[PDB]
């Protein structure tokens, strides 16, 4: 409960500033550096995962991978609230692995989505990825992401700049 | 989950 | 370079520090945020540690080190400076090592394991990797607060500084 | 070791 966002922000405050060495480029899964082309998540990892209700309608979750299985090039995953029936299994496509290093601003600030992309971005106080664009980067290690997420709520269509850790905020693999 |  | 080396090693180690979350009855161990360390602790090569130094020139400071090893034959430590400058090992009595946290404590569960307003501890001043002599200001609130301390400062007419931040992994008795 | 005397 405030016990689930406790871990969430652990989550988040834990993740490993990638440290590389002068002159090394950072690797696949340091902050916006994508996966490599083939890859295929470990039990435990956290992702975002796409899960489509009985009525059809879209959402994609926080949740932790439980399995792949090559005979049939689906995952299970876990929603991270491990709450009821917490299990779903899932293409590929709608897995998307989060970060397993904060890019430190410092030394590689390539590895961080810039302002104006359009991310996926977990909502504050939430277990859910939305669409959002980038306002600021960090530029402290600790420091969070700013984005506005699309929010119809608001005439202009964004809400104010809300913080989000950069365990989560992945590429924007969902259509408006 | 925990939605919006 | 070396001052963002030292800034983001910092970090690093302040905010991997684990939570400790227990299951009720369970009561927070050893070196969880401001509960001491056993009698008779020996800390383990890795561990971070505050380390009372003597330079050269006699000047001491308390220094945030690692262990690399602890010897029962002399009873006496070896810690490395987490900065590469420092290019001495030092060979270091046990009332010279006080270990680091281990765990922050949860404020929200465990705040009897943080330190109390106005206890006199040592904290790590920011932009150094020293600990310094300071009372606390204000205990965190959340499990990602820093402490508020009042450093002792000569340099204020009334000898404290303004509250300054200092992570849970830097804060340890005086 | 950074130092107070150094950083200030």
Not at chain 1, 110 to 118: G, I, S, T, V
Not at chain 1, 122 to 137: E, G, N, S
Request: hydrophobic fraction near 35%; charge should be negative.
């Amino acid at each position: 409960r405030g016990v689930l966002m406790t871990l969430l922000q652990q989550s988040a405050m834990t993740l490993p500033l990638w440290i590389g060495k002068p002159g090394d480029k950072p690797p696949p899964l340091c902050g916006a550096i994508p996966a490599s082309g083939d890859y295929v998540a470990r039990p435990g990892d956290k992702v975002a995962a796409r899960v489509k209700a009985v009525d059809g309608d879209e959402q994609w979750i926080l949740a932790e991978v439980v399995s792949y299985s090559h005979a049939t090039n689906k995952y299970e995953v876990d929603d991270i609230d491990e709450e009821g029936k917490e299990r779903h299994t899932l293409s590929r496509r709608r897995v998307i692995p989060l970060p397993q290093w904060k890019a430190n601003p410092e030394t590689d600030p390539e590895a961080l989505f810039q302002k104006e992309q359009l991310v996926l971005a977990l909502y504050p106080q939430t277990t859910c990825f939305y669409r959002a664009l980038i306002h600021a980067p960090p530029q402290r290690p600790q420091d969070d992401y700013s984005v506005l997420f699309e929010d119809t709520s608001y005439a202009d269509g964004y809400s104010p700049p809300l913080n989000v850790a950069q365990r989560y905020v992945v590429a924007c693999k969902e259509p408006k | 989950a925990r939605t919006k």
